[PDB]
Assembly symmetry: C3
Homo-oligomer: 105 residues x 3
């Protein structure tokens, strides 16, 4: 009689815990999908809740993670900065040659 | 019977422990979400539903809600810059050749 | 039959403990996949969270994607500024060259 009230409580709890477990699994997968969405690049969700590879294009390179794409951008930017540095130096020299010519003619 | 009363109390205690563990797991998921928001940056944050709210990444005059589109905008911008540099190198080529010719005539 | 009901309860609890262990594994697996997608040395923390990446842009050091993107955006703007300057310098150089050619 009274022991039975306890058994029914326990079974009720187990039922609700099983619901909580199913809800937690759904939450995890929803989090996974949100991560795939904010990574972009075609990243998607596997059945094990992991996020599979995006395809990020930088120049003629393809990359499966943000760091490698950022690094490819960074390298290209540095090459451009170097070239800009060279151009600016060349233009300085050209200005000097013109100033010299203008003086002498 | 005492022994079954006592077993049932132990089971109820086990259930309480399990409920505590489920609560801890939920907190773990939300802490993971927060860390992902932090690592994405761009003002990303955790939704009440545990998902990560979109970042806002600026590239030039665009705003982007995901890393791939932002990388793509940067890659385009970079190509545009490279093409402008090429044009500049051509202008310099011709200017240098003019200056060499002027130097002949003086 | 109370002992049978207890047996059934303990069985359901066994399964729940298994699903909890499975759930923890899922969380740490997701975290690892996020670390892999971020790159930059990001890793899974003992506590389940993603330890920060390290991204280099220019002379700088960044621990999140947005800051690195912003640093790249700003470097591009700075380059555009230098292009502005170069075009202006070219404008003036060409004008001076044209004037010299009228005078020699």
């Amino acid at each position: 009689k009274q022991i039975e009230d306890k058994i029914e409580e326990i079974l009720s709890k187990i039922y609700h815990i099983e619901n909580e477990i199913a809800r937690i699994k759904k939450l995890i997968y929803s989090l996974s999908q949100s991560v795939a969405d904010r990574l972009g690049g075609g990243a998607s969700v596997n059945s094990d809740g992991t996020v599979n590879a995006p395809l990020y294009e930088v120049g003629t390179g393809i990359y499966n993670n943000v760091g490698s794409a950022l690094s490819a951008l960074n390298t290209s930017m540095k090459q451009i900065e170097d070239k800009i540095e060279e151009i600016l130096s060349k233009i300085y020299h050209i200005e000097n040659e013109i100033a010299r010519i203008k003086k002498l003619i």
